[PDB]
Amino acid sequence: MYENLCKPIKIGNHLVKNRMKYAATVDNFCDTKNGNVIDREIEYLRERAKGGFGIVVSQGGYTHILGKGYVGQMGLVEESHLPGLKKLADAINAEGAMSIGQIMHTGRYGHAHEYGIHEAIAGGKTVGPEPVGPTAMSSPIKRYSPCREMTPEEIEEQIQAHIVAARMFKQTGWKGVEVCAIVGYLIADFLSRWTNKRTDKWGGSLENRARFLIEILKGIRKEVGDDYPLVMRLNSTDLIEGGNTDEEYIEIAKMCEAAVRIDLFSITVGWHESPGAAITAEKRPGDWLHLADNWKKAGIKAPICMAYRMNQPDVAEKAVAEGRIDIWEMCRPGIADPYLPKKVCEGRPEDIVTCTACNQGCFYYVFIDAIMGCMVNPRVGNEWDPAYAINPAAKKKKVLVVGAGPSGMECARLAAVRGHDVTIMEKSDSIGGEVKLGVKSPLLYDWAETIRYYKAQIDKLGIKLKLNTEATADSIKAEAPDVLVIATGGKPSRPKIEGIDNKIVTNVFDILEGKVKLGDKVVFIGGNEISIQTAEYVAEQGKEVTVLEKGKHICFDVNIFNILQHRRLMAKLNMKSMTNVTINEINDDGVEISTAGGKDVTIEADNVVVAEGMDADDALAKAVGTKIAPEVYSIGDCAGVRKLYEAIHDGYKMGVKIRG
Ligand SMILES: CC(C)(COP(=O)(O)OP(=O)(O)OC[C@H]1O[C@@H](n2cnc3c(N)ncnc32)[C@H](O)[C@@H]1OP(=O)(O)O)[C@@H](O)C(=O)NCCC(=O)NCCSC(=O)c1ccc2ccccc2c1
Numbered sequence: 001m002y003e004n005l006c007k008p009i010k011i012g013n014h015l016v017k018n019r020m021k022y023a024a025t026v027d028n029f030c031d032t033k034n035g036n037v038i039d040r041e042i043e044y045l046r047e048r049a050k051g052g053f054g055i056v057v058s059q060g061g062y063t064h065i066l067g068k069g070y071v072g073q074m075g076l077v078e079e080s081h082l083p084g085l086k087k088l089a090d091a092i093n094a095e096g097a098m099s100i101g102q103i104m105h106t107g108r109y110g111h112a113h114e115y116g117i118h119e120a121i122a123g124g125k126t127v128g129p130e131p132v133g134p135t136a137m138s139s140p141i142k143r144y145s146p147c148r149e150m151t152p153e154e155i156e157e158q159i160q161a162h163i164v165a166a167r168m169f170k171q172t173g174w175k176g177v178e179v180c181a182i183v184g185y186l187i188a189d190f191l192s193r194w195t196n197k198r199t200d201k202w203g204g205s206l207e208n209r210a211r212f213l214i215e216i217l218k219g220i221r222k223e224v225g226d227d228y229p230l231v232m233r234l235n236s237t238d239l240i241e242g243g244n245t246d247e248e249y250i251e252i253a254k255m256c257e258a259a260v261r262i263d264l265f266s267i268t269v270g271w272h273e274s275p276g277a278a279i280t281a282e283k284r285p286g287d288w289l290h291l292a293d294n295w296k297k298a299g300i301k302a303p304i305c306m307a308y309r310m311n312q313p314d315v316a317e318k319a320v321a322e323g324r325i326d327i328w329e330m331c332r333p334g335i336a337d338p339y340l341p342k343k344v345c346e347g348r349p350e351d352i353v354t355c356t357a358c359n360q361g362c363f364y365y366v367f368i369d370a371i372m373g374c375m376v377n378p379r380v381g382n383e384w385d386p387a388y389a390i391n392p393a394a395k396k397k398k399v400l401v402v403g404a405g406p407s408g409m410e411c412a413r414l415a416a417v418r419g420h421d422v423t424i425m426e427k428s429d430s431i432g433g434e435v436k437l438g439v440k441s442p443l444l445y446d447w448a449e450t451i452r453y454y455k456a457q458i459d460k461l462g463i464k465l466k467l468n469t470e471a472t473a474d475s476i477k478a479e480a481p482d483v484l485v486i487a488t489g490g491k492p493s494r495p496k497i498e499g500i501d502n503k504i505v506t507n508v509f510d511i512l513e514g515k516v517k518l519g520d521k522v523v524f525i526g527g528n529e530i531s532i533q534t535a536e537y538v539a540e541q542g543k544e545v546t547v548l549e550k551g552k553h554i555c556f557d558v559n560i561f562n563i564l565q566h567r568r569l570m571a572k573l574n575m576k577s578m579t580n581v582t583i584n585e586i587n588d589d590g591v592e593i594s595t596a597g598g599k600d601v602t603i604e605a606d607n608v609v610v611a612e613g614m615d616a617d618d619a620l621a622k623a624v625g626t627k628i629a630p631e632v633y634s635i636g637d638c639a640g641v642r643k644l645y646e647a648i649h650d651g652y653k654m655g656v657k658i659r660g
């Protein structure tokens, strides 16, 4: 089934069992006080190695405190870091994965001041805690603070720190070393003409900008020796106006191959300051592969790997078959499903927990300096935690799950995996709940992969699925289960708006279930994530859509990464939006609003969607109490409206805790 992806490959002298590589992922799982590797990190990475990845990369470790860019970033500076690095290599290696350690000074993106640092020693001098770069400059975005210009002594010290980092990996049993020269971190800062205005030997010509990197590479090669695998990450495109050209990145790669033997090139897209889409759902699998072709035709010797929205095994298999890339590299597909390679090579891709590119538990949580999680994978960061262990149930119980939404389906899946006798009662003709409605939205196409996964799991686990079956107090009593799990989700709210009872008024459920025929002018009251995604579905059908928000911003419940993707799509779809508006009335003609400036205006509509929020659909839970069955639980939105992350996590927590 996946002959090309499951084919072995030599990386330097080391033979890798397949073409699937798990990419570097800073997750804030390391000790925030000192950069030490701890059990949370060991177990996270051990699971990707158990999952069958041929190559497992560590997160990028800072070579100096000023280069620490995440609250729990791994350190590569002191002798005290060596024990944890050994423990991490042993855990990855024992699984038969090639352990590769990554070196990553975050440069201009450093946040030492926020991590309780007020002073440090750099280039033999006491300096402030500000981030460092080849040139003193500011960032076009708030997140990153103005950087200080490194002295040549600081530049020389960093080459030495990179060599030391490489030595630390080799002595602790790591099978290879990866130099992170991407996305706007320190090396990428010296490489790009946008960030490097230096007039000495470290900037100017392309060779001068590449000198820091070449010196780091030459230094590492001399230290680790000729037989040790030395790999690297380099941009194929920075998506920065005034940055380096795509051909320039190829010329840099050729400078690297000419100085040291490079055993693998990981090719990347964008900088964190890039205004364009790189990793969102706007990018489909294979949208970046032409870049790999250009590296191949330029004559790059070393094997090449590429990630960047490559979440589909069929797209990657073809890419490797055609020799476009030698290795399918991935980060978020491996966060979502650490067993993706084991599933690919056993020929069971219907079992894959696909990454939906929601950027919540991964990108968002890490950038807001929180412990990394995952929407579709509740085990992310919890692999080390005994409360998340999946153990067979001693005595089998009759488990009744009410509702085939994501919380109910995750609970049912875990309870059946652990050996319970599980039944799901679903009031509609299909599974998925609000996920089934959401999949109609332009950016939520990968939600069909979530429906596919659960449908295949229910089948395989022998869960008794009862569709078109509304659970009532009497049908529960007839079923007589040992455990009742209520997962009836949420329902659109009905705020106290004048003229809400008007026939022009509809809701998000009616739109997405096809229970309403819409006109040409459609007006949405509410600017939350759900309202926006239903509005985007309506506008994509070539209709005139206006979104009215009483609060200060639209997409107020949307994470920082997805905010941009909605701005781009609402512009492309010619969508109108108004914030700080007072909704006065809904009438036959549309909705009467008063702006914050005091202007009374009529928003003309054929349909008015009242989408201000969701209420818990808890009527069943209130009707039956806590005594209808020996154990009664409410999970997901019916227990209090939250979002998908909390629904899938509630489901998992419920499924693992059902006792025997
Ligand atoms: C989520 C951000 C990281 C930060 O956003 P934030 O809201 O925190 O920005 P800020 O607080 O500074 O406010 C700036 C304003 O501009 C907007 N904005 C922020 N970043 C922007 C941007 N990059 N382009 C255009 N506009 C941007 C933002 O919505 C906001 O609007 P406002 O609320 O009305 O003031 C954002 O810059 C962003 O999504 N950038 C694109 C990320 C990207 O594609 N990177 C390359 C692919 S990922 C990659 O290769 C990589 C490599 C190493 C990594 C290591 C660790 C973690 C991730 C890594 C990823």
Ligand SMILES: Cc1cc2nc3c(=O)[nH]c(=O)nc-3n(C[C@H](O)[C@H](O)[C@H](O)COP(=O)(O)OP(=O)(O)OC[C@H]3O[C@@H](n4cnc5c(N)ncnc54)[C@H](O)[C@@H]3O)c2cc1C
Binding pocket: 402, 403, 404, 405, 406, 407, 408, 425, 426, 427, 428, 431, 432, 433, 434, 435, 437, 438, 441, 469, 470, 471, 472, 487, 488, 489, 490, 508, 512, 529, 530, 533, 534, 617, 620, 635, 636, 637, 638, 642, 643, 644, 645, 647
């Ligand atoms: C258009 C849209 C877009 C969204 N976008 C996002 C997003 O981008 N990010 C995010 O985090 N969240 C998003 N959400 C919210 C997210 O989908 C929900 O939070 C999540 O589905 C809640 O899961 P749940 O299992 O608790 O409930 P539900 O998904 O609502 O499932 C409940 C299920 O129970 C069934 N049911 C109800 N009563 C009974 C009964 N008595 N007997 C039997 N079955 C019954 C229903 O038919 C349904 O299948 C979106 C929702 C919608 C509608």
Ligand SMILES: Cc1cc2nc3c(=O)[nH]c(=O)nc-3n(C[C@H](O)[C@H](O)[C@H](O)COP(=O)(O)O)c2cc1C
Binding pocket: 023, 024, 025, 026, 027, 058, 059, 060, 102, 104, 180, 182, 233, 268, 279, 307, 308, 309, 310, 329, 330, 331, 332, 333, 362, 363, 366, 372
């Ligand atoms: C939470 C998170 C942390 C990341 N940390 C690193 C890192 O330490 N080093 C690195 O080179 N890339 C890092 N990346 C980038 C990924 O390795 C990957 O190249 C990128 O997310 C695109 O691939 P994908 O679509 O498979 O996720 C990170 C990405 C995420 C989601």
Ligand code: SF4
Binding pocket: 332, 333, 335, 336, 354, 355, 356, 357, 358, 359, 360, 361, 362, 363, 373, 374, 375, 376, 377
């Ligand atoms: S949190 Fe969302 S984007 Fe990140 S790995 Fe999980 S499903 Fe993918």
